[PDB]
Design a protein around this ligand. Sequence first.
Ligand SMILES: C[C@@H]1O[C@@H](O[C@@H]2[C@@H](O[C@H]3O[C@H](CO)[C@H](O)[C@H](O)[C@H]3O)[C@@H](O)[C@@H](CO)O[C@@H]2O)[C@@H](O)[C@H](O)[C@@H]1O
Ligand SMILES: C[C@@H]1O[C@@H](O[C@@H]2[C@@H](O[C@H]3O[C@H](CO)[C@H](O)[C@H](O)[C@H]3O)[C@@H](O)[C@@H](CO)O[C@@H]2O)[C@@H](O)[C@H](O)[C@@H]1O
Lengths: 305, 306
Amino acid sequence: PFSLPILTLSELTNSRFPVPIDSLFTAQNNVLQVQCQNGRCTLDGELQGTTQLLPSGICAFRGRVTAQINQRDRWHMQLQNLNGTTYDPTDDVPAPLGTPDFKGVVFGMVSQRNVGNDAPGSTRAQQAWVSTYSPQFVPKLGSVNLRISDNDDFQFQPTKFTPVGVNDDDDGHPFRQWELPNYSGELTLNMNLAPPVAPNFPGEQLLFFRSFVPCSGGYNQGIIDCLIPQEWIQHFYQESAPSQSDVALIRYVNPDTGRTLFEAKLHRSGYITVAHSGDYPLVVPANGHFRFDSWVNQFYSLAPM
Amino acid sequence: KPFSLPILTLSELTNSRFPVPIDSLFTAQNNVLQVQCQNGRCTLDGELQGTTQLLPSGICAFRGRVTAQINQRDRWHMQLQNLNGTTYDPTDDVPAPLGTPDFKGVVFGMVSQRNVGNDAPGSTRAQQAWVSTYSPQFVPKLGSVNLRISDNDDFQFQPTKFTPVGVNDDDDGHPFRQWELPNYSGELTLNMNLAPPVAPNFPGEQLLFFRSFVPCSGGYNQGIIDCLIPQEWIQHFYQESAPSQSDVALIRYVNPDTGRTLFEAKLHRSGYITVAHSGDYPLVVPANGHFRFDSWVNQFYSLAPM
Ligand SMILES: C[C@@H]1O[C@@H](O[C@@H]2[C@@H](O[C@H]3O[C@H](CO)[C@H](O)[C@H](O)[C@H]3O)[C@@H](O)[C@@H](CO)O[C@@H]2O)[C@@H](O)[C@H](O)[C@@H]1O
Ligand SMILES: C[C@@H]1O[C@@H](O[C@@H]2[C@@H](O[C@H]3O[C@H](CO)[C@H](O)[C@H](O)[C@H]3O)[C@@H](O)[C@@H](CO)O[C@@H]2O)[C@@H](O)[C@H](O)[C@@H]1O
């Protein structure tokens, strides 16, 4: 029988950036498509897009630095899969699993640990940035280029990128959470994408699990919204409960009082809709959580949120 | 009601003592020095212990406000909150705020700030930082730690988060010692409310660890951090809260392709694993393998040699 894990918002991890969930948010419908590639999973447990299971994999890279070029995006990083295995560009994914799914700069740290004949075991780490606007951001082809703070202490050796936050670039390239990067560079279409999501019933809007992630300068709010949290993804992967219909009715409950605060539709393809009109940050008690009620269908009419 | 494990390969598991994937399994020779980590501690019926909390992103992280600086290497005084942003209570029955590092060394990563109130609200900044758990100002139980940062001219008295990236030895000699607990209340104080030490005491048995090689920031340290059970098992036991039928759950490492069992192990009620083996040994196992629950046995069950 299908179920959700029992977890409060502060016990949940954002599936599009590795931080806790801060709040719930419903957004007004708009012509601009929602088509994130991280945090995508069906209710019967099929991961989609660039989604993988580990919070520490989200927006991370692993590989070898193999060259440098005379450009701002200086250091060429040939990618592996996050578990260290060889990346195959012909696999049926948009990019290596964990790759960022938005336009912007991800900041964090790079670390290296030498192998082979040149000082094996020697290490180093420093601040780095990955711009997903860069012409050298071509993860589907098997590489990205890094900007680092100290060009004199970086070798052609195995490298990991650990994300900390996001920002706008300079030069007029803003942080746009709903714009997909070009995974294969400038004139090539993205492939094998998880499909766009949108409400289909009148009066319905998407409900998001929202985080305010760190930024590295200026005034950006750091908003990253996901469809379902990483812990639900991990749970659906395990259970693989056959979905009885296209829509699971779920209720947000206060476990202390025992009462239901509102209801929502959890769709088979892994997103939530609510009956509401307008942008609204939800105000709900800190102990609250969703519970599965019953299988319904597309025509089920939700009580207003 | 019936006990179980989540079905996950090693590359699908997260270290419960540092936020990275598991790299390998390791059994260690029995030693005089005790294992008493405070992160990654959970009973099989789902009671978290020590400084253990549920989120991989909480492990070795801090959250709070920077309130002062001092004329010492550990310069910036960070008054801590709980990781969810609520007020930290020093009289709570824990060794330290949940997520606090449980080893002697330096944790390196980044600090980030986001202003609130009257001074440029919304303005942000981030840079490299280090937290030494040897520091006399590392007093998380009392409610604060002091940070070293790379740029002392761009840091304010504002809400701050520390995100860990790796570990190292300090550069004045003080080594990275994963099995030595820090003093959570500083010099001349004893730790309280600790999760107990763990050790085998069936003859021929050794602890089995889930091992990760975490990033280091210079020199040759291997970055070894061993945990007793992975974060995903902790999360699973917390959800299930299955009553434990005996002191020991017999578990089998299986290859799901071939269908065969490769070795067996004892999963103890208090949340650690023992195997029948003599000597330090990095296990060699197929990449698709995973543990499965077999049955409830007792402390004196005799394991097939591994
Ligand atoms: C709001 C403001 O944003 C950040 O500062 C940036 C500038 O960043 C540069 O200058 C600051 C010094 O104030 C600092 O030295 C930093 O390391 C350096 O990169 C800069 O990008 C300008 C661009 O014209 O905009 C901002 O002022 C941040 O560092 C500040 O603390 C502050 O939050
Ligand atoms: C093994 C070595 O570890 C790190 O180097 C440090 C030394 O750092 C100094 O040298 C490196 C380059 O070799 C670099 O230029 C650095 O900025 C500079 O501070 C130094 O601290 C010594 C002291 O005993 O230890 C290490 O050698 C690392 O930077 C290196 O890349 C290299 O892996």
